[PDB]
């Protein structure tokens, strides 16, 4: 080819010491789970099938790919320090699709559609603090 597919994120040797609090991790997880139910998200659920789509040089244009499952795995492995990194990863996913395919491609409109859905949900994200009377041992 044809640049090979880069290794999966995250690097389980650089897991952050202070991850996002669980109440924030539960929210962004349910948010990503809600986006994964959207019919428009199907192409973004998993890494690109470079053989089925016949894009041998895809990883030459996109050196850092991203998908909804990777974002989900990084949350489950506590790889994020701030919820803004989850937003940045979702943005990178949309950016890669528009960069490679272009605003004319209908797959870019699917990415735009799920990004709007993601942004509507992230409006109600709880603050990084715990709450009112949540106790600390």
Numbering used by the authors: 191 to 327
The authors write:
In conclusion, Bdf1 BDs are required for the viability and virulence of C. albicans and can be selectively targeted by small-molecule inhibitors without compromising human BET BD function.
The ligand-binding loops are structurally well conserved, including nearly all water molecules implicated in ligand recognition, although the overall binding surfaces are less negatively charged in CaBdf1. However, whereas JQ1 fits snugly into the Brd4-binding pocket, the fit with the CaBdf1-binding pockets is poor. Replacement of Brd4 residue Leu94 by a Val or Ile residue further contributes to the poor fit. In addition, the p-chlorophenyl group of JQ1 occupies a groove in Brd4, which is absent (BD1) or shallower (BD2) in CaBdf1 (asterisks in Fig. 4c). A similar lack of complementarity between the ligand and binding pocket explains the insensitivity of CaBdf1 BDs towards PFI-1, IBET-151 and bromosporine. Five of these residues in BD1 and four in BD2 are invariant across human BET proteins but diverge in CaBdf1 (magenta arrows in Fig. 5), including the WPF-shelf Trp residue and the Leu residue opposite this shelf, at signature positions 1 and 3, respectively. Remarkably, nearly all of these residues have shorter side chains in CaBdf1 than in the human BET proteins, implying that selective CaBdf1 inhibition could conceivably be achieved via small molecules that clash sterically with the human, but not fungal, side chains.
